[PDB]
Amino acid sequence: MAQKPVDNITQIIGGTPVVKLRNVVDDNAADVYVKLEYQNPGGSVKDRIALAMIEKAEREGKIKPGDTIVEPTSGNTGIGLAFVCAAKGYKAVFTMPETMSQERRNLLKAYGAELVLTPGSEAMKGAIKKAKELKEEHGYFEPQQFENPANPEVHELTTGPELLQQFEGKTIDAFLAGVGTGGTLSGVGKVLKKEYPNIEIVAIEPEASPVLSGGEPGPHKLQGLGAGFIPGTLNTEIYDSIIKVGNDTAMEMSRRVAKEEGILAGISSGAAIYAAIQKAKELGKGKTVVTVLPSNGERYLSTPLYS
């Protein structure tokens, strides 16, 4: 049993499976289920929002095949947008600090994307500044992943309802998600709160950059998380609590999950799984806990995660 043939690779974005953890969680804690968002064709959760923001601008008429989009991105949003642009016939320009790995550049350029390297010392600030300059000078479309309401909406329409159908007749007691743009938590949390009125929505952020908790931004290693600010795409009213995770605990959790469960995922997934187990221990046997693994660990073979 497989999906019928589709015309376009973007048509099989979504519908990601869920796996129960067997070994890294005790039988005396709640059941922990993980949704594998790296099962998307582009390899991460950003597949959904890359498709949504392009389909939106396409439907509105802001872009049509042949046009160029620009986005300042250092992570999975660049891969997703490069993937979707090549699939839908759009030109892609991404601005990033010149500190980005050659492997990452090769991945983006493989999709035909054009890269505009910005000063490494300016980090993401210089990339945002350069994308704005190209947008005003050339009229490129800027998706703006941190302000586009299509980002949390696509999780309200697909990721959320997916989990509703996947946990048909069962009670989800806690949903947790790492906050990057916040769209995953906002979109899914909105859908889950309507069906499960007593559900707890927990946000996950780096303990070294606890901005949602009221702390100061700082350097951290939880790739995909810790933007250092509160994004407009995050609904700060959706989560009932926050779990901060350290750099090494998330790392150690990803290694344990890969070895003991056969699930090879990124560092933010280790942060998500570590927080979900802490919440599972809190709820105890008989309860149900769900989180999201945004990316695959193969994307991070040159990070200290698997070196």
Q: What is the token pair recorded at 5?
A: 């043939």
Rounded to 5°, the CA angle 134-136-138 comes to: 60
> Residue 66 interacts with its own copies (CB under 8 A)?
no
Q: Which does 84 bind (CB under 5 to 8 A by kind): its own copies, another protein, none?
A: its own copies
- C-beta closer to its own copies: residue 212 or 264: 264
Q: Least separation, in Å, of the C-beta of 102 and its own copies? A: 8
What contacts 8, CB < 8 A, 6 or more positions away? 87, 88
Site residues (vs another protein, CB under 8 A): 73-77, 97, 99, 123-124, 145, 180-181, 209, 217-220, 223-228
Q: Which amino acid is at 20?
A: K
Residue 285 known to be catalytic = no
Do the beta carbons of residue 20 and residue 33 sit within 8 Å?
yes
| Binding track over 103-142 against its own copies, x by CB under 8 A | x--xx-xxxx------------------------------
Residues 167-206 interacting with its own copies (rule: CB under 8 A): 167-168
Catalytic residue among 35, 44, 46, 269: 46
- C-alpha separations of 66 from 62, 69, 70, 110 in Å: 12, 10, 13, 18
Three-class secondary structure of residue 200 per DSSP: strand
> Residue 1 interacts with its own copies (CB under 8 A)?
yes
- C-alpha separations of 243 from 152, 193, 208, 271 in Å: 21, 19, 12, 9
What contacts 44, CB < 8 A, 6 or more positions away? 37, 38, 76, 79, 80, 294, 295, 296, 299
Measure the CA dihedral 199/244/165/57, to 10°: 120
Q: Which does 155 bind (CB under 5 to 8 A by kind): its own copies, another protein, none?
A: none
Residue 46 known to be catalytic = yes
Active site residues: 46, 268
Interaction site with its own copies (CB under 8 A): 1-12, 14-20, 22, 33, 36, 39, 41, 43, 83-88, 102-103, 106-107, 109-112, 162, 165-168, 255, 258-264, 296-299, 301-302, 306-307
Residues annotated as binding site for pyridoxal 5'-phosphate? 76, 180-184, 268
